[PDB]
Amino acid sequence: YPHVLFDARQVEPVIFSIPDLRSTLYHLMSDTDTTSLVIMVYNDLINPYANDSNSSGCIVTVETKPGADFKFHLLKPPGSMLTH
Amino acid sequence: SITAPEQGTPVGGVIAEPSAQMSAAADMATGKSVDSEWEAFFSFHTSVNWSTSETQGKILFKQSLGPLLNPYLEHLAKLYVAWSGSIDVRFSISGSGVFGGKLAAIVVPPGVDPVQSTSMLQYPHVLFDARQVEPVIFSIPDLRSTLYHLMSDTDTTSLVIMVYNDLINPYANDSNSSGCIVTVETKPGADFKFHLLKPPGSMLTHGSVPSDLIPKSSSLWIGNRHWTDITDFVIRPFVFQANRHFDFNQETAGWSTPRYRPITITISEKNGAKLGIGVATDYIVPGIPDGWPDTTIPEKLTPAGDYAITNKSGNDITTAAGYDGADVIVNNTNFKGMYICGSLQRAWGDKKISNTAFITTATKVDNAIEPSNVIDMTKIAVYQDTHVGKEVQTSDDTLSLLGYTGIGEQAIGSDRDRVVRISVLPETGARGGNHPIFYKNSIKLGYVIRSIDVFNSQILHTSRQLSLNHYLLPPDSFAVYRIIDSNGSWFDIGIDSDGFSFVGVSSIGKLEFPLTASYMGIQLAKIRLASNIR
Amino acid sequence: PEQGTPVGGVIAEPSAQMSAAADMATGKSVDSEWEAFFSFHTSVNWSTSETQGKILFKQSLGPLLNPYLEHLAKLYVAWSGSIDVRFSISGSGVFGGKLAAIVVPPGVDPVQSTSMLQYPHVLFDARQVEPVIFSIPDLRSTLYHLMSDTDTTSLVIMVYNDLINPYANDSNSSGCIVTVETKPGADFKFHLLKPPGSMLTHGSVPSDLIPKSSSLWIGNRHWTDITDFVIRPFVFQANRHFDFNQETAGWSTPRYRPITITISEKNGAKLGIGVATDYIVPGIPDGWPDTTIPEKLTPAGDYAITNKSGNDITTAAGYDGADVIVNNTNFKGMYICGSLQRAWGDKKISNTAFITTATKVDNAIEPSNVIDMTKIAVYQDTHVGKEVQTSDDTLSLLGYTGIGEQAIGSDRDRVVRISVLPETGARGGNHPIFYKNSIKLGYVIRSIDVFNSQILHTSRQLSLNHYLLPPDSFAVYRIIDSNGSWFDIGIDSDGFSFVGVSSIGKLEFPLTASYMGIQLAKIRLASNIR
Amino acid sequence: QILHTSRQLSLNHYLLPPDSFAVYRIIDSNGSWFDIGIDSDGFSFVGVSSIGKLEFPLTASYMGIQLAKIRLASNIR
Amino acid sequence: AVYTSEPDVRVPEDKPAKLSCSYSGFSNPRVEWKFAHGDITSLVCYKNKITASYADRVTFSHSGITFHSVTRKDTGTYTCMVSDDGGNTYGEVSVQLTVLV
Amino acid sequence: NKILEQRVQGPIQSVRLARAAGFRVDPYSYTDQNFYDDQLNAIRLSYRNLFKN
Amino acid sequence: NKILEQRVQGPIQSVRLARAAGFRVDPYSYTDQNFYDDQLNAIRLSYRNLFKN
Ligand SMILES: [K+]
Ligand SMILES: [K+]
Numbered sequence A: 001y002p003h004v005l006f007d008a009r010q011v012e013p014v015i016f017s018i019p020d021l022r023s024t025l026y027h028l029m030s031d032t033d034t035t036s037l038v039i040m041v042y043n044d045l046i047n048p049y050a051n052d053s054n055s056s057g058c059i060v061t062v063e064t065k066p067g068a069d070f071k072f073h074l075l076k077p078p079g080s081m082l083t084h
Numbered sequence B: 001s002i003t004a005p006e007q008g009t010p011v012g013g014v015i016a017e018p019s020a021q022m023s024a025a026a027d028m029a030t031g032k033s034v035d036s037e038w039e040a041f042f043s044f045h046t047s048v049n050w051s052t053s054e055t056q057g058k059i060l061f062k063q064s065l066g067p068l069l070n071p072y073l074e075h076l077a078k079l080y081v082a083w084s085g086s087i088d089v090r091f092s093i094s095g096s097g098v099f100g101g102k103l104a105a106i107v108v109p110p111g112v113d114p115v116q117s118t119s120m121l122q123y124p125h126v127l128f129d130a131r132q133v134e135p136v137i138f139s140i141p142d143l144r145s146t147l148y149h150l151m152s153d154t155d156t157t158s159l160v161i162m163v164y165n166d167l168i169n170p171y172a173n174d175s176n177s178s179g180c181i182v183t184v185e186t187k188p189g190a191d192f193k194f195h196l197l198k199p200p201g202s203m204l205t206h207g208s209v210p211s212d213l214i215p216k217s218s219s220l221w222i223g224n225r226h227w228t229d230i231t232d233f234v235i236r237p238f239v240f241q242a243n244r245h246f247d248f249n250q251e252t253a254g255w256s257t258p259r260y261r262p263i264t265i266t267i268s269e270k271n272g273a274k275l276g277i278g279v280a281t282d283y284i285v286p287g288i289p290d291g292w293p294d295t296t297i298p299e300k301l302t303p304a305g306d307y308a309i310t311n312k313s314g315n316d317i318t319t320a321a322g323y324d325g326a327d328v329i330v331n332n333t334n335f336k337g338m339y340i341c342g343s344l345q346r347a348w349g350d351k352k353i354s355n356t357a358f359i360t361t362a363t364k365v366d367n368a369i370e371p372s373n374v375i376d377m378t379k380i381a382v383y384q385d386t387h388v389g390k391e392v393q394t395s396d397d398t399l400s401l402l403g404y405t406g407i408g409e410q411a412i413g414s415d416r417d418r419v420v421r422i423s424v425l426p427e428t429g430a431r432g433g434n435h436p437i438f439y440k441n442s443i444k445l446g447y448v449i450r451s452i453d454v455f456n457s458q459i460l461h462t463s464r465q466l467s468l469n470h471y472l473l474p475p476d477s478f479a480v481y482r483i484i485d486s487n488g489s490w491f492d493i494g495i496d497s498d499g500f501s502f503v504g505v506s507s508i509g510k511l512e513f514p515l516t517a518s519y520m521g522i523q524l525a526k527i528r529l530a531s532n533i534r
Numbered sequence C: 001p002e003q004g005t006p007v008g009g010v011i012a013e014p015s016a017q018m019s020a021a022a023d024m025a026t027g028k029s030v031d032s033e034w035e036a037f038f039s040f041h042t043s044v045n046w047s048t049s050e051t052q053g054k055i056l057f058k059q060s061l062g063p064l065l066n067p068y069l070e071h072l073a074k075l076y077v078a079w080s081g082s083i084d085v086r087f088s089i090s091g092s093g094v095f096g097g098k099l100a101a102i103v104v105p106p107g108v109d110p111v112q113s114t115s116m117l118q119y120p121h122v123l124f125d126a127r128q129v130e131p132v133i134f135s136i137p138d139l140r141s142t143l144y145h146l147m148s149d150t151d152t153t154s155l156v157i158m159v160y161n162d163l164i165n166p167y168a169n170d171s172n173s174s175g176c177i178v179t180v181e182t183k184p185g186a187d188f189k190f191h192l193l194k195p196p197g198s199m200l201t202h203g204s205v206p207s208d209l210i211p212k213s214s215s216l217w218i219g220n221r222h223w224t225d226i227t228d229f230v231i232r233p234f235v236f237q238a239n240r241h242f243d244f245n246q247e248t249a250g251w252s253t254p255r256y257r258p259i260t261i262t263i264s265e266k267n268g269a270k271l272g273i274g275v276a277t278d279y280i281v282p283g284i285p286d287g288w289p290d291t292t293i294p295e296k297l298t299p300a301g302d303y304a305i306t307n308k309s310g311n312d313i314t315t316a317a318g319y320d321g322a323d324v325i326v327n328n329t330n331f332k333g334m335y336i337c338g339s340l341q342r343a344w345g346d347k348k349i350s351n352t353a354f355i356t357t358a359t360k361v362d363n364a365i366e367p368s369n370v371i372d373m374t375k376i377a378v379y380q381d382t383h384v385g386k387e388v389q390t391s392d393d394t395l396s397l398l399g400y401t402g403i404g405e406q407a408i409g410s411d412r413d414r415v416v417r418i419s420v421l422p423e424t425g426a427r428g429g430n431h432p433i434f435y436k437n438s439i440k441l442g443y444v445i446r447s448i449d450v451f452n453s454q455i456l457h458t459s460r461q462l463s464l465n466h467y468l469l470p471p472d473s474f475a476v477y478r479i480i481d482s483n484g485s486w487f488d489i490g491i492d493s494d495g496f497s498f499v500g501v502s503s504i505g506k507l508e509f510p511l512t513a514s515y516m517g518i519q520l521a522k523i524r525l526a527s528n529i530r
Numbered sequence D: 001q002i003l004h005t006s007r008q009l010s011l012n013h014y015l016l017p018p019d020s021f022a023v024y025r026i027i028d029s030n031g032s033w034f035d036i037g038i039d040s041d042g043f044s045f046v047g048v049s050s051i052g053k054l055e056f057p058l059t060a061s062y063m064g065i066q067l068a069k070i071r072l073a074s075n076i077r
Numbered sequence E: 001a002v003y004t005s006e007p008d009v010r011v012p013e014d015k016p017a018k019l020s021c022s023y024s025g026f027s028n029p030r031v032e033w034k035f036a037h038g039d040i041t042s043l044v045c046y047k048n049k050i051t052a053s054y055a056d057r058v059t060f061s062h063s064g065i066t067f068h069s070v071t072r073k074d075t076g077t078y079t080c081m082v083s084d085d086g087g088n089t090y091g092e093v094s095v096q097l098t099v100l101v
Numbered sequence F, G: 001n002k003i004l005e006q007r008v009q010g011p012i013q014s015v016r017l018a019r020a021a022g023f024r025v026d027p028y029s030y031t032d033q034n035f036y037d038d039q040l041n042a043i044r045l046s047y048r049n050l051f052k053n
Helices: B023-030 B071-076 B460-469 C020-027 C069-075 C455-463 D002-010 F003-008 F010-018 F038-051 G006-007 G011-018 G037-051
Strands: B043-048 B060-066 B080-084 B087-093 B101-109 B136-141 B159-167 B181-187 B193-195 B232-235 B265-267 B359-361 B435-444 B451-454 B480-485 B490-495 B501-503 B519-521 C037-045 C055-059 C083-088 C099-102 C121-125 C155-159 C179-184 C230-231 C259-262 C335-338 C340-341 C353-358 C376-379 C392-395 C397-400 C431-435 C439-441 C447-450 C478-481 C487-491 C497-499 C511-514 D026-028 D033-038 D059-062 E008-011 E017-020 E028-039 E042-043 E064-068 E074-085 E090-099
Touching: B043 B060, B043 B071, B060 B181, B080 C020, B101 B136, B136 B480, B460 F038, B501 C020, C353 C392, C397 C439, E008 E017, E017 E090
Parallel strands: E008 E090
Antiparallel strands: B043 B181, B060 B159, B080 B193, B087 B136, B087 B181, B101 B159, B232 B435, B435 B451, B435 B501, B480 B490, B480 B519, B490 B501, C037 C179, C055 C155, C083 C179, C099 C121, C099 C155, C230 C431, C259 C392, C335 C353, C335 C397, C340 C392, C353 C376, C431 C497, C439 C447, C478 C487, C478 C511, C487 C497, D026 D033, D026 D059, E017 E064, E028 E042, E028 E074, E074 E090
């Protein structure tokens, strides 16, 4: 499948703009059948600076941002404010 | 740093070059199209019946839209999670000249629960008289509310055949066993196109498509109640099982698993009891063992001795081939009805050849037992010659099931009250004019060499996959599998959500058993199935 | 002008503007996508112990270099054009050492030496930033291949400079692991559509040789679930050992059902010979086990332990509180069964049995590993008298009567075989294995170690599917556990399982098994277990 | 000397200077390896200090020519 | 033609017991069971039917009988007597039951 | 005939000890199934969660 | 002499000891040919697999 790769010697952080692929004009809040991102391993790391017990080292921070085309739709009055 | 999906250093063909003067040479010898060739002919799809008993307004073939209507596309659709567009269709009849009678072909839009009547014909209807030699072409457009569809969506446009005028055979008004086979063939329109590569190895959420529920040979078929092989099928109005019967929600009312392994339990008895109570070692439900059988004794009894079989209530003990003359073999035994199991009596001080099991489920009131319509950790029965005395002689036993003891009885499963259920018993009746079924294998007796019949609700491979995998089927639908013998005599099996099979006739007879299978789609429950036999 | 009589009886025929509005959501913009990106194929382990001349990858040309195209070669009988390739080595800037590539022509079959480097070759190092691409051309005397002309422009890679792993003597598995990603050239073109069902069963892939769990694994010699693995230098088994040719020297099927036989015996005897009624090899009951007795025997009786001196053993670690466990019984070492016994006559229970492969001395048996109708043996009470009693029978296996040994498949000589005994040794630096299991005994509650050579679910798929593979390759599967300690398994064409690590230790057994690809045999398979 | 080595020398006029080898490689079936040299005289030569036990079902191949007065190559375990 | 499957039997007290009378070559047989221990005796069956003295703890079949339970009193010897309705054909078999007190 | 018993209570006579004067000892922690009952439970444990949702 | 033998029943004893306890043990896993029998089969088994197809 088309995969993008990036290395652990990365300087500038990386973005991966997710799109909204769908069959309907606008989603709801309850929908789940949506696009989804995954990260998976392609070359196992290397470090001589760790141990079998502890695992200090690699952590993969993830951050988000709405994007330009992001738009809510169909205002509602509070009450309802379902709160789940 | 990053390498994109198509990012690399082209050194290329080291000794040579991927030329272009050559590829066009291969082209001109074989000819070409726009990267596809299954958009220029009519693949074969299927074939169905049209007999005299199908009166007016009745239906033969409803399949919805989707790539299943073209075997080139069902193949490719395992690469994509989506589709959009229409189909072109061609159907026809292989009818005689005498066989008058007229037929119809409708595209019904979505969101319809159609009816085996004639009011559908007020829609735009196509015709095809049996006398009509040449075929007909028409289309199936994708009338939808969404921008596209998914493979787990089955709420689309759909084709239906309908009997605009019934069949006639003026000659043989004695048997009414006539033919008029139908065929259907498909070509996609250029509007058709997939979307959205599915990452290979990835499933769907709503569920996969059921096309591996049944294997492609009788040789790989065995019953979900006994390990023996299929021989023949059976119809009943009422059908039911609980042991290894799984539903498309991966659930069951059972205690067991889709295996046939040796069972292991732990007797603990004394005083020459020979009537212990087995506790569990492995299970999925507490108390009950895994692979434990589903059958109760017929009635109360008292196990002391051993076998006995007599002609009638006035005569001998047949013990020979001169036994069929009875017709009322009555089995006046020490005990009855049990299932036999091999054994391995491991007890730390039982230096003797271990001995056979003779188990079932039943209540142990006393040295006698009584029937257990329902199962529980107290209702487990054994009758071994476990080598014991005054002293407690605990042992693991490691049973494994072989045969049966209830000589003279009918094929197991019919006796509902003898059948075991924890609390719930999945059951069905007829359905849309179909009939449910069991699957008949054999099982072996204790004394004589012979073998009594046994019923089964499912093939085992049909049950392993459902415990595991998350298939898709709406409740008002079946999974249509076509069964073919070594002849060209064939029919179709539907399977509901519960796992119970269904059939669109009331008999089979006998047939060349080296039979196969193949998936054919998703037909409703209302509808009658195919039957091309004799 | 195809046959038909089209009709405008239907109503809608909607616009072909939707077909854009499908392409408006999904960025289709294309007919076929696999012609415009790269696709994973497999992975290797260019470990430290590989030298100047080994091969890491070798595949003749074909669709099989891309798992999309392989799914479409079922719809054609032809192809023509180049395929592209891409590599990526995992040594970001660390691992020294380079490789060398060759495009051998069609007709040759390259070898594992340096001499191939007397030919135009390309090299690339591991200190990469930008991976490589090789456009395998198509070279042929014909106009189009047929999905069977294996004689094509094969690719080759061999080592030129060995690696250097600065800090991992044996810390990680190999470090240097390199992928193989492919894409068809723009000139790649199938031809000659076919119907699926006509010519097929060519290139079925080894992807379901093992499950993806292990709670449902079992051995090819006894029904019990696996517990862990066992390395040996040598391996051997015949029964239920199916290769990648739908064959075996074994007599049996890849399944555990009971065994129907009949024994005609007289003079009130027990010991007898079994005749076959459910066979695939004439004479054998298709389920018969694979091991002989150790010694001559004269079966008459019952069990005994004797504790080296005379003191018998029942005392719940009397079996354990005993120097040796010399079994002084007369049907020692043979398997165990359930043995329902149907017969006209006996209104009696059907005692259990004891079976093994051996001859007679008219009341006494001897081991002889070869098998036929005669070498069968049983030992049942059978409730007999003078008259020849037919005694139809059916047997299901439960245990192994032999007590004080651990001799259940390590004895190459005590294994039953028709004539031949499939074996393997190490290859590359990969060693073979047994899948251990666990089987029960006759007298005491204990159990014992067991051996196998194949998972049963691995052995039946080979009965009935043509999984394509060459001889000099494996079918990798990347096992992990519930502790992170992972490793690999290959599967030779014979059906034996090989592995690349010296030892295992012990591991959290609730583990999976994922497919990875194909791999040359002469390669250290990987592991970084804890 | 292997016989097959000594047979071919009996017949075929192989070429080598006086101070070089005709190096061949060895690969035990554990994946390890070491090289071997052959002087004009016929005496085999090696560069390691030890061998020990090894997976004997092994192979051999030809790498090239090497000057005699140099330590050969090797890799063990 | 009369025989059994088990000419001698060994059971503890309070436990069941089955006792066979495998007849053959008859048309409308009438059957009897008789106790026997030392000189003590009692008919247990009569005309294919159990007495009123033992009907509570005893069953009947044409192919044998089955006791719901036993005592040490039943220690001894039983016997099955067959006869075709007509006095035509005949057979017997005698069984010893020892309780394992 | 009781000095030998102390070898039977090797561990607890050390762990009932240190807990008494007066430490925080925590031997209960283990991770690896090296007992043959622990994994055998894990066989069945993974076998049930598989079928049962 | 009854202690003398215990050396000869060294290995299987420890195995047969540990296995009676709730342990799991993998002594079988040897990989090298060191005994000179495993070596010798590898000769013939390679040679027999050579002329054989
Ligand atoms: K026993
Ligand atoms: K019998």
